[PDB]
């Protein structure tokens, strides 16, 4: 008897009917507070174990950043790879960020994962256009391509790298695009020249010039100061009045 | 349905004129009821047969030989 011809038309089954939808008002940051305290304690331990290297630490919403100098990259990474309580074995990303107001303009960021403990950590160093950073390819082979990309985009030289060359950009590209002084459209363009029978690189001319529209940025301060979510164990003590 | 009885039955429904027109235009033999006509002269049809699959139930018969 039963077949696809005598099949239940589910389009006419009664649907769930809800009068009022109830959703409580909750702050998404309140979910993180205990973990934040835990990361604070953890970072305190790392700072106390490596006071020669760790300049600082910072903590925001399940993200711990460790603040070190270039000389301190290889030691701290060895610690973060081989120590039993800090088994960050997977390299996730290596990046650079241009802060041209700083004397050391580039901030080289490292992201690490521990599948053992299911935790992530971040490590930040600094660099310039001419001062290099130590390569962590000796520890993480996955860092090769990432460090290459950081060089190609920003110009950060990683000393110790086996083959540091451009990875993203054209084979004779002159410049490092993600620098803030590099323009969006770059300096050159390409066409086919029928005379030379060749693809020729020429200066830039746009039929429609780029329109930024960042002049419409808000003149009023959008978001105030945040909310202090340090635990009381990591706020300095106010002395009793008397 | 990709069977011969389909094309034979439809070509019995739509006469041989429509069969040769459809063979020269669509490549397939379809029988449906006329739904309407547009301002350009294209006729639009709809089928009710179980043989025709999802998204093959509505079709067009253009007026121009250089259809588009």
């Amino acid at each position: 008897a039963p077949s696809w011809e005598n099949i239940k038309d589910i389009r006419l089954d009664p649907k769930v009917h809800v009068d009022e939808v109830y959703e409580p008002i909750v702050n998404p940051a309140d979910r993180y507070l205990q973990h934040v305290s835990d990361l604070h304690q953890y970072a305190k331990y790392i700072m106390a174990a490596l006071p020669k290297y760790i300049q600082g630490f910072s903590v925001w919403k399940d993200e711990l950043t460790l603040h070190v100098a270039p000389s301190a990259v290889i030691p701290v990474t060895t610690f973060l790879r081989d120590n039993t309580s800090t088994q960050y074995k997977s390299i996730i990303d290596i990046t650079a960020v241009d802060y041209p107001s700083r004397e050391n303009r580039f901030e080289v960021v490292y992201n690490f994962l521990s599948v053992r403990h299911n935790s992530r950590i971040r490590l930040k160093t600094y660099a310039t256009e001419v001062t290099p950073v130590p390569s962590i390819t000796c520890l993480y082979e996955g860092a090769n391509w990432f460090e290459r990309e950081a060089y190609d985009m920003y110009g950060v030289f990683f000393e110790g790298h086996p083959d540091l060359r451009r990875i993203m950009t054209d084979y004779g590209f002159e410049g490092h695009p993600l620098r803030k002084d590099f323009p969006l459209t770059g300096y050159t363009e390409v066409r086919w020249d029928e005379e030379k029978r060749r693809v020729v690189y020429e200066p830039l001319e746009l039929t429609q010039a780029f329109r930024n529209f960042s002049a419409g940025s808000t003149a009023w301060e959008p978001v105030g100061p945040g909310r202090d979510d340090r635990p009381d164990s990591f706020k300095l003590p106010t002395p009793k009045p008397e | 349905s990709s069977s011969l009885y389909r094309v034979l039955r439809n070509a019995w429904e739509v006469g041989p004129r429509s069969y040769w027109k459809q063979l020269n235009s669509i490549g397939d033999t379809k029988s449906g009821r006329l739904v309407g006509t547009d301002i350009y002269g294209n006729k639009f049809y709809e089928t009710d047969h179980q043989d025709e699959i999802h998204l093959r139930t509505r079709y067009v018969e253009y007026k121009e030989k250089d259809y588009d």
């Binding site: 589910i10 997977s90 599948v115 971040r122 082979e141 993203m168 940025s217 | -």
Partner: protein, 233 residues
């Protein structure tokens, strides 16, 4: 959240598709899974160890085929994966056959999740009800003054994000996909780096494909599941 709510009659059709997708999976498996030639082209090709899988930065099926039970949907759930039941496939031997089996198990678990979501879809809004972050509805933008102001600003200047930075990731079907954003308090990002899962895998190609013949390199590129927009960004 989401741009527009679901149109009417979509869950029924998704269920109609789900009632039959399993047989499609089964028909693909009949050709591929127990086949001699498939196993020859896949068994003990592209082998990567768990330790080297971690050192190279691999994730997803590439890391789960080597034996490590890691999935961000279970270890750090983000949207609703903490409210739906699914299993994670993990394989030994680190080969391409194990990755293929992992991906077919992931097909079936995605179907499971789709069933549960079609059964347990709640009511309410699909985007945040804060019109300083999301556009209001049109019938309020065309009757309420605050709604129109907020529409205007969100579509001209944009919403201003607090200053800071975040690396967050998902278990993309390719692996661990991540975005390192920096906010300067402005409406535009200061820095956005995409951690594409294919970048690391194609970087590991040199380690994985050494000692292999050229027909096996094709299988390795195929099991890395390399789309090049993400590799090159």
């Amino acid at each position: 959240g989401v741009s527009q709510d679901l149109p009417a009659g979509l869950l029924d059709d998704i269920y109609m598709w789900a009632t039959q997708f399993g047989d499609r999976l089964d028909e693909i498996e009949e050709l591929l899974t127990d086949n001699r030639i498939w196993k020859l082209r896949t068994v003990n090709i592209g082998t990567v160890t768990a330790q080297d899988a971690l050192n190279l930065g691999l994730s997803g099926p590439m890391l789960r085929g080597s034996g490590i039970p890691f999935d961000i949907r279970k270890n750090a759930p983000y949207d609703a994966y903490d409210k739906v039941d699914f299993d994670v496939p993990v394989g030994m031997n680190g080969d391409c056959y194990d990755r293929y089996l992992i991906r077919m198990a992931e097909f079936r678990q995605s179907l499971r999740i789709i069933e549960q979501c079609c059964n347990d879809m709640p009511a309410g809004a699909v985007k945040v009800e804060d019109f300083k972050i999301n556009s209001p509805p049109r019938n309020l933008m065309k009757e309420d003054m605050e709604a129109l102001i907020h529409h205007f600003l969100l579509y001209t200047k944009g919403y201003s994000v607090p200053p800071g930075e975040t690396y967050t990731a998902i278990e993309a079907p390719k692996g661990e996909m991540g975005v390192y954003v920096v906010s300067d308090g402005s409406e535009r990002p200061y820095k956005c780096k995409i951690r594409a899962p294919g970048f690391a895998h194609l970087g590991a190609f040199d380690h994985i494909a050494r000692g292999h013949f050229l027909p096996d390199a094709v299988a390795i590129i195929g099991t890395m599941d390399l789309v090049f927009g993400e590799v090159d960004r």
